[PDB]
Structures are given as structure tokens and as C-alpha cells.
Ligand binder design. Structure first.
Ligand SMILES: Cc1cccc(N2CCCN(CCC(N)=O)C2=O)c1
Ligand SMILES: [Zn+2]
Length: 140
């Protein structure tokens, strides 16, 4: 689990969104595994607006933050799962790192701010849903 709290927005994995998230919906995209809902309180996270390919992510199944090198956001085939049919997921970045299903939502960050959240994994890989192109998260 986990979310990004920027401005009056809560960014979560679409597959982990709550009923309250759907009832306060701003935007969602199944092809990216992202959903954004509105919040009453202002958050403290800042979104990175950069080209970093190195950063640090939080792994809840280890209670640890790990430094990683990650690929540029791309269209990657993601196997049918209990959350989606077999499909290509867009804006996904891969790295070598430990992950388990409940690690989704952990933040990946660089020196500029939050880069994305854990969305996929297995066999010593971890995939992150990028948010750096979502410029509207910085306004309204
Ligand atoms: C982090 C992690 C580790 C092990 C496994 C996973 N699973 C669990 C099942 C669903 N997906 C796919 C989600 C999607 N974005 O389509 C995973 O990759 C995640
Ligand atoms: Zn950066």
C-alpha cells in the first residue's frame, strides 16, 4: 500500500483504490495503473520534473529504502494477474530490486522529488508507475 500526497491530490495504484477514492475521483488510467482522488488536507510530497534514472524506493516487505537504477518510462507487457487482463502497461520503469504484491504504492524518489510508485514486480524486479509527466498534479 501507499500513496503520494501532493497539493489536494492523493495518487494511488488504481488496483488498490478505495471506495472513498472512487467517490472523490479526479483521474484514472488503467493502462498506467494510476488513480488520483481529491483530499481535504494539503500534502507535503513534491513531484520531480527531471530526467533521473537513479533514485531510491521504499520496500514495505523489507522495511527498507533501496537505491536503484531504473529504465525510462516505456510500454511493457504485464502478465494477466488477479487485477488486470494480459496487457501492455504504459509509462512503466523497471529496476532490479526486491518486491512483493503488497509493496505496491511505495514511493520512488530522486534528488528532485517523487518520481513514481511501485506498481509491478517479481523475481528480483520491481516496476514503477511514472508520474513526472503529470504536470497538472502541481496546480489547482
Ligand atoms: C510489486 C509486486 C511484486 C510481485 C508481484 C506483483 N504483482 C502482483 C499481481 C499484480 N501485478 C501486476 C500489477 C499491474 N500493475 O498490472 C504485479 O506485478 C507486484
Ligand atoms: Zn530527478
Amino acid at each position: 500500500s501507499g500513496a503520494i500526497y501532493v497539493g489536494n491530490y492523493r495518487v494511488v495504484n488504481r488496483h488498490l483504490a478505495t471506495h472513498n477514492d472512487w467517490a472523490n475521483l479526479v483521474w484514472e488510467d488503467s493502462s498506467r495503473d494510476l488513480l488520483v482522488s481529491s483530499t481535504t488536507a494539503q500534502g507535503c510530497d513534491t513531484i520531480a520534473r527531471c530526467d533521473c534514472q537513479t533514485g531510491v524506493y521504499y520496500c514495505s516487505s523489507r522495511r527498507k529504502h533501496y537505491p536503484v537504477s531504473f529504465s525510462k518510462p516505456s510500454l511493457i507487457f504485464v502478465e494477466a494477474s488477479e487485477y488486470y487482463p494480459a496487457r501492455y502497461q504504459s509509462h512503466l520503469m523497471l529496476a532490479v530490486g526486491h518486491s512483493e504484491p503488497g509493496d505496491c504504492g511505495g514511493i520512488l524518489r530522486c534528488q528532485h522529488g517523487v518520481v513514481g510508485i511501485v506498481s509491478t514486480g517479481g523475481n528480483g524486479l520491481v516496476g514503477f508507475a511514472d508520474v513526472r509527466d503529470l504536470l497538472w498534479l502541481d496546480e489547482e
